[PDB]
Amino acid sequence: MQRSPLEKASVVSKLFFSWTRPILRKGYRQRLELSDIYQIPSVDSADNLSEKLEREWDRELASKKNPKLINALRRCFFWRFMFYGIFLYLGEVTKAVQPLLLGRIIASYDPDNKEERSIAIYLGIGLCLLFIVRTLLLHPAIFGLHHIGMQMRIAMFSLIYKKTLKLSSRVLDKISIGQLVSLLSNNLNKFDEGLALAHFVWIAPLQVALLMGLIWELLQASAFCGLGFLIVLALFQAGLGRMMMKYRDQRAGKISERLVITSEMIENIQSVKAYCWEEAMEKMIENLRQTELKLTRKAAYVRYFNSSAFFFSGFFVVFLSVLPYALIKGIILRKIFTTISFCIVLRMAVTRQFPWAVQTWYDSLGAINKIQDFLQKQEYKTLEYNLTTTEVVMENVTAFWEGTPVLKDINFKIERGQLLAVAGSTGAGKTSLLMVIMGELEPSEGKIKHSGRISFCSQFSWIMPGTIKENIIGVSYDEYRYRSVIKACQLEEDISKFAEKDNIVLGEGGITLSGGQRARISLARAVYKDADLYLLDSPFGYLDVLTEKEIFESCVCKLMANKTRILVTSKMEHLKKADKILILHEGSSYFYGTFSELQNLWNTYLRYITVHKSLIFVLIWCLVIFLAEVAASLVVLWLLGSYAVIITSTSSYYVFYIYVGVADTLLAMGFFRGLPLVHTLITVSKILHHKMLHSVLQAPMSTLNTLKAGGILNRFSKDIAILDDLLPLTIFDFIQLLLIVIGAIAVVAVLQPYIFVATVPVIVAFIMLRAYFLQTSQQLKQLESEGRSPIFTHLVTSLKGLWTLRAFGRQPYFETLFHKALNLHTANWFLYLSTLRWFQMRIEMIFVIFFIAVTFISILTTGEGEGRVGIILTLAMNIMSTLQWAVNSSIDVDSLMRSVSRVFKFIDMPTEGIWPSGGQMTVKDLTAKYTEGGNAILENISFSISPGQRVGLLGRTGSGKSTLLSAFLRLLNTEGEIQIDGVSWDSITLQQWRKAFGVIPQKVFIFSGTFRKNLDPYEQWSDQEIWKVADEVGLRSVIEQFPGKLDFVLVDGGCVLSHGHKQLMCLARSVLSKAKILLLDQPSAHLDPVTYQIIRRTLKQAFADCTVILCEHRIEAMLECQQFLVIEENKVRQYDSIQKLLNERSLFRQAISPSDRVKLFP
């Protein structure tokens, strides 16, 4: 990774962009490597840009009553922005005066024009210098504006992320992940290219004033008749832009709603497969796409008329201004052609450059104001303190999540070094109590007083990407402390069974880990940090009795006996070793005191075209009409082979020049062709999205584990939007230009078969340079597109762990990691944008030398009479002016076609592919492994389950209990044989095999949607049945506390619910499914013994029949099981009674609670 060559480039090298030569030569022959990409220039580093704009934005907040973000942007970039505007203007003025020189050179071919001939050579010298100046003025200026826009985007994106880490929890409900991704993705490439267009909001009016005075010289008052037509088009295009904005704004809300639902289902893909919810989720997303695709089409129709105004105005603007003059006095062909030359530039300013500039300001200012509102949102108030009385005291705190208070009149005092136990039922407010202490939930009444040093362990374990060792420690590294906590947390046994010991690369959310392993890593992280108060929100949920006992008596009670700590626990054996006990019920303190006190009381193009047959028929329809237009032109043109229009034998060559200047209107695609073309291009994107989503839900789990969350969102957000908005119009413009060039050459070749010969050297030169450039351009665009994924990945993980980020104070670390993602994307994007400027500058320089060669040859060969070489050659160069536009348009199409190839790559992902009456199942030689060629988790497992009995699956955390349950459903690589009721799993199809099971996953899955939709996504059960199940599982009181009884929309994964309420939701689904074989993966993870009775009574009433495989850790749930399966050292051991199982194991029964002990051994 070498230093940027721009740093030491010479002045001439900067001007011509010659410093890009090394990578253009390397990428042509062989593929680019990681070492070929240079570092970013220091000026556009994210760190420097963020500090610059932040320093100026703070001045507005302290100097003006109405702080504006645009004023801070002006103070940073205005003078460079306006500096490039004057050179862009001068290049366009050089363009406006070209017909003054070129028109006289063309007139010198007529022997009658003796005045033009006398100075023809001097006009050639001036014309050549005109071309050179224009080339050197435009391209450096346009690239300078591109660089300013890139720096503006980077600076604004850093401020957005820094604000995100400060947002208050009360506004987090209203800010979804889809909203933030939409804001970033929409401006990722659009914003940077916009600054090249912004200056035309004032350049174009000045061009119109200049050109109208030159047209006035020819046609005195008749000129204004053509201007009035352009004013009508200007008002028409202004109305089109306002309609397009209206449709786009209405569509924005549905796009954000789609992205959040798409992210949720792919994160929980394993639960989706186990439930067999692929069909329901596809139909759910399909209805969201349908509503937003209607607004896409209406916007696309309006944008057709906006982009067709240029081509259709070519004839009428000239005709309206030539006709009144010709009727009063005769007009010569020379004067007609000169009017056309000026009007070509005039039409470009009015109908192409100005409205695009106006729309750019609407887009940029719309995004700036949207970001400005985000930067002023409510901020998290950190009430940190330097010191205290070394104790924490709470005084009659009442809190609301907003009419029922979550907490009321809570008070307690905890002296230094004491342990407080928090008890209660499900939904009693035990988690909310800890949120208020942290300052994450502001109370409406009461006060809290303690020191600022707090350590926090969440009930929902969050794992940041990186190393296991990197998760436990912060940026500091104390080896003696690291070994201490790892031993006390019982992590040594699990670490020794890993390929990298403790240097394993964990994914986002720790997919590769077990449920209880994530709990231990979350607990070890909290105890490693030095603090005054320790908040532990039930870390013993997913742990067995033996591991729980060891950790409690060796880490909580031993390593931190002299530090204040609060423990949420439902075990009576933990209460006996706590200094004080608090019992919550409905948010009220049911009891406060001591224990004793309580005791007493290339191929992408072809595949894109042929995916929909309707597109092929529309293209043929366009082709047939085009042939008739060319044929009609031939007839009328060949037919031409005091009068209103004066023609002479020596002036007849102007006829072909006039045709070329108006060919863009005769060959324009009318609404009979433009509208159906754009309409059918949108149906292609509709089909591709359905195929892409379908294949993702069908891929094997091994493939999906390698995909990162931000790489999934990158394709479904950015690429899909490109196929909807940009590609249909970019293809239309390319097709229009190609037909114009093809038709113009075809018409003049048959009548004059030397123009076709003269244009071959120019055509081949353009094609050869295009082929050379595209070898490197396609690789850089691929690297830049893949550089957007790390930005989205970092955004997702920061929102999921926001509370843990603030608690441990690691905000500066995450801000630095976000700058790495920005700098990584900038390196590829800047390099891609630089080589593109080289190509577009060279394509114009190639045009210049051919025009210079033509100019001098034409003038010198023109003898005393006539001169035919100049007539032919100057016509050929007029045609090649349009091909230059077509070639540049072809590069834009190929840039967008990279998004098509990335979509097809996901579609090509491989697919993973009265019977249930008894429930008997036999297993033979089952071997389970997560990856092919990986280590096995289970080996040669064999057992049999008789029909109708219940089985207890036991074992230590991380032994492979969840692996065994996943092996039944073929969620991993299996090598055994399983026969349910006599049929082998190989014979019957996978889709039928999984439908025989009713599953309760260990990881609960709740998506953004109605209560009714979560319980029943296929809508196959009535409301009465749903309420009937809600009675059995105890969910009526939970539902009725919400405004909508089965109509309330759950958001953010159901954050409104408590942890134990999500368990009852998963129990409700299993009872409603009514499957013969049931696989329950610890259905009572955090329930207190009171709520566990709901599981116990459902186990014998709803599941009175059927074969039930329990996977519980609590000993009380083993009284109902006939058989027992014990996993240890990758092997299953079968028992027939619980007493014989515990007879052989001493340490296991030493950890059993005395209450359960007497129930097992009377």
Ligand X SMILES: Nc1ncnc2c1ncn2[C@@H]1O[C@H](COP(=O)(O)OP(=O)(O)OP(=O)(O)O)[C@@H](O)[C@H]1O
Ligand Y SMILES: Cc1nn(C)cc1S(=O)(=O)NC(=O)c1ccc(-n2ccc(OCC(C)(C)C(F)(F)F)n2)nc1N1C[C@@H](C)CC1(C)C
Residues facing residue 922 across a β-bridge = 944, 979
Q: Which residues contact 268 (CB under 8 A, 6 or more apart)?
A: 1003, 1005, 1007
In 3-state terms the chain splits into helix, strand, coil percentages (rounded to 5) of 65, 10, 25
Contact between 1060 and ligand X (CB under 6 A)? yes
Contact between 517 and ligand X (CB under 6 A)? yes
Residue 962 interacting partner from ligand Y, Mg ion, ligand VX8, none (CB closer than 5 to 8 Å by kind): Mg ion
Contact between 507 and ligand X (CB under 6 A)? no
The CA-based dihedral angle spanning residues 964, 570, 173, 273, taken in that order and rounded to the nearest 10 degrees: 10
Contact between 842 and ligand Y (CB under 6 A)? yes
Candidate list 96, 214, 346, 615; residue touching ligand CLR; CB under 6 A: 214
> In Å, what is the CA distance from 50 to each residue of 54, 182, 626, 731, 1111?
6, 21, 54, 38, 52
DSSP state of 913: -
Residue 213 interacting partner from ligand CLR, ligand Y, ligand X, none (CB closer than 5 to 8 Å by kind): ligand CLR
One-letter identity of residue 1114 = R
Alpha carbon 430 to its chain centroid, in Å, reads 36
# residues contacting ligand X (CB under 6 A)? 38
Candidate list 175, 212, 701, 848; residue touching ligand Y; CB under 6 A: 848
Contact between 667 and ligand X (CB under 6 A)? no
C-alpha 978/C-alpha 999 separation (Å) is: 18
Contact between 45 and ligand X (CB under 6 A)? no
DSSP state of 329: S
> In Å, what is the CA distance from 23 to each residue of 14, 38, 42, 840?
16, 10, 20, 17
# residues contacting ligand VX8 (CB under 6 A)? 14
Q: Which is nearer to ligand X, 302 or 584 (CB)?
A: 584
Minimum distance between the CB of residue 196 and ligand VX8, rounded to whole angstroms?
A: 9
Minimum distance between the CB of residue 820 and ligand CLR, rounded to whole angstroms?
A: 48
Contact between 155 and ligand VX8 (CB under 6 A)? no
Minimum distance between the CB of residue 155 and ligand VX8, rounded to whole angstroms?
A: 11
Residue 1060 interacting partner from ligand VX8, ligand X, ligand CLR, none (CB closer than 5 to 8 Å by kind): ligand X
Residue 849 interacting partner from ligand CLR, ligand Y, ligand X, none (CB closer than 5 to 8 Å by kind): ligand Y
Residue 165 and residue 814 in contact, taking contact as beta carbons nearer than 8 Å: yes
- Binding segment (CB under 6 A) for ligand Y, from list 118-126, 267-275, 740-748, 844-852: 844-852
Minimum distance between the CB of residue 359 and ligand VX8, rounded to whole angstroms?
A: 9
Q: Which is nearer to ligand CLR, 217 or 279 (CB)?
A: 217
- Binding segment (CB under 5 A) for Mg ion, from list 49-57, 553-561, 604-612, 994-1002: 994-1002
Residue 1056 interacting partner from ligand X, ligand VX8, ligand CLR, none (CB closer than 5 to 8 Å by kind): ligand X
Residue 395 and residue 447 in contact, taking contact as beta carbons nearer than 8 Å: yes
Contact between 993 and ligand VX8 (CB under 6 A)? no
Minimum distance between the CB of residue 712 and ligand CLR, rounded to whole angstroms?
A: 53
Helix or strand holding residue 1110 (H, E): strand 1107-1110
Residues facing residue 983 across a β-bridge = 980
Residue 385 and residue 532 in contact, taking contact as beta carbons nearer than 8 Å: no
Q: Is 419 helix (H, G, I), strand (E, B) or coil?
A: strand
Q: Beta-carbon neighbour count of residue 292 at 10 Å?
A: 17
Residue 344 interacting partner from ligand CLR, ligand Y, ligand X, none (CB closer than 5 to 8 Å by kind): none
Minimum distance between the CB of residue 21 and ligand Y, rounded to whole angstroms?
A: 4
Contact between 398 and ligand X (CB under 6 A)? no
Minimum distance between the CB of residue 469 and Mg ion, rounded to whole angstroms?
A: 23
Q: Which is nearer to ligand VX8, 357 or 1125 (CB)?
A: 357
Q: Where are the beta strands (DSSP E) in 987-1076?
A: 997-1000, 1009-1010, 1049-1050
The footprint of Mg ion on residues 425-444 (CB under 5 A) is 431
The footprint of ligand X on residues 966-1025 (CB under 6 A) is 1002
Q: Which is nearer to ligand CLR, 29 or 329 (CB)?
A: 329
Q: Which is nearer to ligand Y, 24 or 212 (CB)?
A: 24
Contact between 205 and ligand CLR (CB under 6 A)? no
Residue 271 interacting partner from ligand Y, ligand CLR, ligand X, none (CB closer than 5 to 8 Å by kind): none
Give the CA angle between residues 181, 184, 187 to the nearest 5°.
140
Contact between 963 and ligand X (CB under 6 A)? yes
Contact between 135 and ligand Y (CB under 6 A)? yes
Contact between 10 and ligand Y (CB under 6 A)? no
- Binding segment (CB under 6 A) for ligand Y, from list 537-545, 840-848, 924-932, 1147-1155: 840-848
Contact between 246 and ligand Y (CB under 6 A)? no
Residue 1083 interacting partner from ligand X, ligand Y, Mg ion, none (CB closer than 5 to 8 Å by kind): none
Strands 1049-1050 and 983-984, bridge-based pairing: unpaired
Q: Beta-carbon neighbour count of residue 432 at 10 Å?
A: 19
Computed from CA positions of residues 933, 939, 942, 947, in that sequence, does the dihedral angle turn out positive or negative?
negative
Known binding residues for ATP are: 401, 424-431, 459, 930, 955-962
Strands 454-457 and 533-536, bridge-based pairing: parallel
DSSP string, 606-637: HHHHHT-HHHHHHHHHHHHHHHHHHHHHHHHH
Known binding residues are: 401, 424-431, 459, 930, 955-962
Give the CA angle between residues 192, 193, 199 to the nearest 5°.
105
Contact between 361 and ligand VX8 (CB under 6 A)? yes
C-alpha 523/C-alpha 547 separation (Å) is: 13
Residue 516: closest CA among 911, 955, 847: 955
Candidate list 128, 136, 175, 206; residue touching ligand CLR; CB under 6 A: 206
Residue 512 interacting partner from Mg ion, ligand X, ligand CLR, none (CB closer than 5 to 8 Å by kind): ligand X
3-class DSSP string for 783-826: HHHHCCHHHHHHHHHHHHCHHHHHHHCCHHHHHHHHHHHHHHHH
Candidate list 3, 31, 59, 74; residue touching ligand VX8; CB under 6 A: 74
Residue 77 interacting partner from ligand VX8, ligand X, Mg ion, none (CB closer than 5 to 8 Å by kind): ligand VX8
Contact between 221 and ligand Y (CB under 6 A)? no
Q: Where are the beta strands (DSSP E) in 560-693?
A: 564-568, 580-585, 588-593, 645-646
Q: Which residues contact 933 (CB under 8 A, 6 or more apart)?
A: none
DSSP state of 379: B
Straight-line distance from the first to the last Cα atom of the chain, in angstroms, rounded to the nearest whole number: 73
Residue 360 interacting partner from ligand VX8, ligand Y, ligand X, none (CB closer than 5 to 8 Å by kind): ligand VX8
Contact between 957 and ligand X (CB under 6 A)? yes
Contact between 21 and ligand Y (CB under 6 A)? yes
DSSP state of 728: H
Which tokens sit at 595? 């224990």
Give the CA angle between residues 1060, 1061, 1065 to the nearest 5°.
120
Alpha carbon 47 to its chain centroid, in Å, reads 23
Give the x-and-dash track for 1030-1059 against ligand X (CB under 6 A).
-------------------------xxxxx
Residue 845 interacting partner from ligand Y, ligand CLR, ligand VX8, none (CB closer than 5 to 8 Å by kind): ligand Y
Which tokens sit at 751? 């009548």
- Binding segment (CB under 6 A) for ligand VX8, from list 67-75, 465-473, 795-803, 989-997: 67-75
Residue 140 and residue 90 in contact, taking contact as beta carbons nearer than 8 Å: no
C-alpha 271/C-alpha 1069 separation (Å) is: 12
Radius of gyration, CA atoms only, the chain = 37
Positions touching ligand CLR (CB under 6 A) are 206, 209-210, 213-214, 216-217
Positions touching ligand VX8 (CB under 6 A) are 68, 70-71, 73-74, 77-78, 81, 194-195, 198, 360-361, 364
Positions touching ligand Y (CB under 6 A) are 16, 18, 21, 24-25, 132, 135, 769, 842, 845-846, 848-849
